[PDB]
Design a protein around this motif. Structure first.
Motif, PDB file in Angstrom:
ATOM      1  N   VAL A  45      27.200  45.354  34.257  1.00 59.11           N
ATOM      2  CA  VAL A  45      27.888  46.178  35.224  1.00 59.11           C
ATOM      3  C   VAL A  45      26.951  47.254  35.750  1.00 59.11           C
ATOM      4  O   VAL A  45      26.515  48.143  35.007  1.00 59.11           O
ATOM      5  N   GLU A  46      26.635  47.161  37.039  1.00 61.48           N
ATOM      6  CA  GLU A  46      25.791  48.164  37.688  1.00 61.48           C
ATOM      7  C   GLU A  46      26.627  49.293  38.294  1.00 61.48           C
ATOM      8  O   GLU A  46      26.234  50.449  38.238  1.00 61.48           O
ATOM      9  N   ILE A  47      27.790  48.955  38.849  1.00 62.50           N
ATOM     10  CA  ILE A  47      28.551  49.863  39.706  1.00 62.50           C
ATOM     11  C   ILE A  47      30.054  49.796  39.376  1.00 62.50           C
ATOM     12  O   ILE A  47      30.703  48.772  39.638  1.00 62.50           O
ATOM     13  N   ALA A  53      27.790  55.118  44.546  1.00 64.46           N
ATOM     14  CA  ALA A  53      26.357  55.129  44.271  1.00 64.46           C
ATOM     15  C   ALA A  53      25.865  53.708  44.024  1.00 64.46           C
ATOM     16  O   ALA A  53      26.422  52.978  43.200  1.00 64.46           O
ATOM     17  N   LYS A  54      24.846  53.303  44.774  1.00 65.55           N
ATOM     18  CA  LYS A  54      24.285  51.968  44.628  1.00 65.55           C
ATOM     19  C   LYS A  54      23.248  51.942  43.494  1.00 65.55           C
ATOM     20  O   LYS A  54      22.073  52.218  43.708  1.00 65.55           O
ATOM     21  N   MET A  55      23.718  51.631  42.285  1.00 66.89           N
ATOM     22  CA  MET A  55      22.854  51.458  41.115  1.00 66.89           C
ATOM     23  C   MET A  55      22.398  50.017  41.066  1.00 66.89           C
ATOM     24  O   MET A  55      23.190  49.129  41.324  1.00 66.89           O
ATOM     25  N   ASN A  90      34.360  46.079  40.005  1.00 63.18           N
ATOM     26  CA  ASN A  90      33.201  46.361  39.177  1.00 63.18           C
ATOM     27  C   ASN A  90      32.102  45.399  39.609  1.00 63.18           C
ATOM     28  O   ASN A  90      32.269  44.181  39.558  1.00 63.18           O
ATOM     29  N   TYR A  91      30.990  45.956  40.063  1.00 62.75           N
ATOM     30  CA  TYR A  91      29.951  45.167  40.712  1.00 62.75           C
ATOM     31  C   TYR A  91      28.690  45.184  39.869  1.00 62.75           C
ATOM     32  O   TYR A  91      28.356  46.199  39.238  1.00 62.75           O
ATOM     33  N   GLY A  92      27.996  44.057  39.850  1.00 69.92           N
ATOM     34  CA  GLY A  92      26.805  43.926  39.032  1.00 69.92           C
ATOM     35  C   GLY A  92      26.204  42.540  39.143  1.00 69.92           C
ATOM     36  O   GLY A  92      26.247  41.925  40.216  1.00 69.92           O
ATOM     37  N   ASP A 115      16.648  38.922  43.810  1.00 68.67           N
ATOM     38  CA  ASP A 115      17.320  39.631  42.739  1.00 68.67           C
ATOM     39  C   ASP A 115      18.213  38.696  41.918  1.00 68.67           C
ATOM     40  O   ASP A 115      18.498  37.585  42.340  1.00 68.67           O
ATOM     41  N   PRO A 116      18.657  39.147  40.736  1.00 63.71           N
ATOM     42  CA  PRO A 116      19.644  38.377  39.963  1.00 63.71           C
ATOM     43  C   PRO A 116      20.894  38.099  40.786  1.00 63.71           C
ATOM     44  O   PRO A 116      21.174  38.838  41.736  1.00 63.71           O
ATOM     45  N   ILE A 117      21.635  37.058  40.418  1.00 64.66           N
ATOM     46  CA  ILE A 117      22.828  36.698  41.149  1.00 64.66           C
ATOM     47  C   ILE A 117      23.925  37.753  40.945  1.00 64.66           C
ATOM     48  O   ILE A 117      24.188  38.231  39.823  1.00 64.66           O
ATOM     49  N   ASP A 118      24.552  38.119  42.055  1.00 64.64           N
ATOM     50  CA  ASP A 118      25.537  39.193  42.071  1.00 64.64           C
ATOM     51  C   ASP A 118      26.901  38.763  41.549  1.00 64.64           C
ATOM     52  O   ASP A 118      27.296  37.589  41.677  1.00 64.64           O
ATOM     53  N   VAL A 119      27.608  39.706  40.921  1.00 61.34           N
ATOM     54  CA  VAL A 119      28.953  39.433  40.422  1.00 61.34           C
ATOM     55  C   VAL A 119      29.929  40.523  40.859  1.00 61.34           C
ATOM     56  O   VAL A 119      29.603  41.702  40.847  1.00 61.34           O
TER      57      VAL A 119
HETATM   58 CO   LIG Z   1      22.335  42.762  43.240  1.00 62.35          CO
END
Ligand SMILES: [Co+2]
Ligand SMILES: [Co+2]
Ligand SMILES: [Co+2]
Ligand SMILES: [Co+2]
Ligand SMILES: [Co+2]
Ligand SMILES: [Co+2]
Ligand SMILES: [Co+2]
Ligand SMILES: [Co+2]
Lengths: 283, 284
Positions: A45-47, A53-55, A90-92, A115-119
Motif C-alpha cells: 500500500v503506497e497511498i 499525496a502521491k507516494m 487504497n492504491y499501491g 514500474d511495478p504493476i498497480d493495484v
Molecule cells: Co505505480
C-alpha cells in the motif's frame, strides 16, 4: 514492520520495510504471492484511500523506500476531480512485478511505464502507507497512462467481509453499482487539471475478469524475474538490490545484509500540507 | 474566538464561542448579517467538508455550544454514500434563524425541524468546526427531512476566489457541473443506510435562486425574532438565552454574564473513533 527516516512532508522523507529489525526491499524482497497459487497476492500500500499525496516505491534508491513523488521540484499531490476526494481506493502495487518499457503489449499497443504493476484495493478499511496486505484480485483495467501500458489491478483485502461475496469482477459491479465506472473516470481525467490530455484504455475501457488478471500479473512477474533473474544488463537507474538468501537467491544483484547504509537521517515530524489537497476540479 | 471544554470525541465535548474572553451564544448572539442588506451573512460552521461527525449547536444548553449529536446513546456519524465522502460541503447554519415547528410552509406543506436554517458552503477552503464565516447566498433547496421543513441554503465564503464568478444559482451549475444534482442526491439518500426512507423535496427537487433564498431566510429570521422577542412563551426545551451588556435588544431572555460563571470540565484530548467513518454505502 516498517520504519521512517528524514523529515515528513518533504523530499527527504523515506519509508523502508524491515523484517526482524533488518531492512528489506519493498520492490524485490516481498513475495508476490502471500499464499501459493491460491490466488492470494501481497500488496504494498503506497497511498491510503481519500489521501492526495502521491507516494511511490522508489526504484532509484537502495532498499527501494517509499517516498514522495516530485514534479517541477515540488511535492506532488493529485487533484480532487469531482465527485472524488483524492485516491478513491487504497492504491499501491504488487511486489516482484515490472511493467517492462521495452515490451509492447498487443492489447494496449504501448510499452510499459517502468514500474511495478498497480493495484486498487477496494475494501472498507483505510490502509496506511507502507502496509503490506494479502489481496484477492477480482479483475483489471487496461489503462494507457501517458501513452504507456499502465494496467490497474482490482483487488480486495482477503479479511474484508465483502471478500466472501466478491469472487469476480462482475460481483463488484452488482454490489458496488457505479463503482467501476467511477474508477475508469478517475484514471481518465486525473491529469486534466494539470493540462495533460485525457488518458485512454485497452478494450474500449472494459474491465477484464480475474482470470485475465493473474495472467497479466504473471507476465509482469516474468519481466521482473528477468530484470532480477540475472540480466546482468543495465536497465537505466533502477536499483535491483535485494537481500538475504533466499530473497532472491538467484540474483546477481543480491547482497547481504546491508544494515549499515540504513543510516540516512533520523526521522522528524514536520510542516504539513501545501497544494490542492483542498480544491474541487470539474472535468 | 472559539473555546473548548470536556473530552473530545465524546458526549461531554462542548465548543463555546467567545468575544474578548467572554462567551456568547452561537445561536442568538451572532448577528445574521455580517454586513447589513449589503448582501452578506454570518455562517456558523458546524461540520468541515469531508468529515463524518455530526456536530451541531445544542439549543438545549446555556450558551448553545456546538457538540456531538447523539442517537442510540452513541456519537452520530454520517454515512459515506457513494461517491461522496462524508459531508461534501462545509455544513452549518445561519445564526438568529428558526425553522419554527409550529409553522407550516406553503411549498413543503410541512412544519419546521426546530433548528436554525441550514447552509452548504461550497468554497475551496475546509473550515474547522466552530468557525464563523461571511458568506454570499446563491440559492436554496427545499428539502423535506423525514417530513420536516429543512431548507438548505447554498452559499459561498466571500473571500473564496470563486465568490463572484458565482453570483446566482445558475452560475453554480455552469462552473460546477454535477454539483447541484450530487447535492440533492446527498440529502435524498443520506439516511437510507440507517433503514430510514429517502427524503423528498419541494418544487420536485428544483434549486431556487438567491432572491427566493433570501426571502426564506428572512422568514426564518422573523421566527427567531419571535422566539427570542421577549416572547414569554414556553416553547423551550430551547434555551433562548442571549447576553450581553447590549446584545439581543430587550429580549426577556437576556442576562448579564452568568455565562462566564459557567466554568466546566476543562479540555481533554481523547482516543479516535471507529464505526463506518470508513465504509462506502451504495444507493443510486
Ligand atoms: Co505505480
Ligand atoms: Co509513476
Ligand atoms: Co500511472
Ligand atoms: Co503504473
Ligand atoms: Co438537527
Ligand atoms: Co442543522
Ligand atoms: Co436535517
Ligand atoms: Co436542519
Amino acid at each position: 514492520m516498517s520504519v521512517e527516516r528524514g523529515t515528513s512532508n518533504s523530499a527527504s522523507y523515506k519509508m523502508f520495510l524491515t523484517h526482524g529489525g533488518s531492512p528489506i526491499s519493498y520492490f524485490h524482497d516481498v513475495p508476490l504471492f502471500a499464499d501459493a497459487t491460491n490466488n492470494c497476492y501481497n500488496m504494498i500500500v503506497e497511498i491510503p484511500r481519500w489521501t492526495n499525496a502521491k507516494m511511490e516505491i522508489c526504484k532509484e534508491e537502495l532498499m527501494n523506500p517509499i517516498k514522495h513523488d516530485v514534479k517541477n521540484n515540488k511535492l506532488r499531490y493529485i487533484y480532487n476531480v469531482f465527485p472524488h476526494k483524492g485516491y478513491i481506493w487504497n492504491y499501491g502495487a504488487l511486489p516482484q512485478t515490472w511493467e517492462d518499457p521495452s515490451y509492447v503489449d498487443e492489447d494496449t499497443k504501448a510499452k510499459g511505464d517502468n514500474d511495478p504493476i498497480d493495484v486498487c484495493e477496494i475494501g472498507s478499511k483505510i490502509w496506511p502507507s507502507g502496509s503490506v496486505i494479502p489481496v484477492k484480485v477480482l479483475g483489471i483495467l487496461g489503462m494507457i497512462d501517458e501513452g504507456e501500458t499502465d494496467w490497474k489491478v482490482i483487488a480486495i483485502n482477503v479479511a474484508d467481509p465483502m471478500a466472501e461475496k466478491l469472487n469476480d469482477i462482475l460481483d463488484v459491479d452488482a454490489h458496488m453499482p457505479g463503482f467501476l465506472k467511477a474508477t475508469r473516470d478517475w484514471f481518465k481525467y486525473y491529469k486534466v487539471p494539470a493540462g495533460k490530455p485525457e488518458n485512454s484504455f485497452a478494450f474500449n475501457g472494459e474491465f477484464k475478469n480475474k482470470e485475465f488478471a493473474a495472467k497479466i500479473i504473471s507476465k509482469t512477474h516474468e519481466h521482473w524475474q528477468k530484470l532480477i533473474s540475472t540480466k546482468v544488463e543495465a536497465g537505466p537507474i533502477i536499483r535491483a538490490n535485494v537481500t538475504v538468501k533466499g530473497s532472491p537467491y538467484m540474483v546477481s544483484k543480491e547482497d547481504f545484509i546491508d544494515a549499515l547504509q540504513k543510516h540516512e537521517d533520523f526521522k522528524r515530524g514536520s510542516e504539513p500540507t501545501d497544494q490542492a489537497i483542498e480544491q474541487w476540479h470539474f472535468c
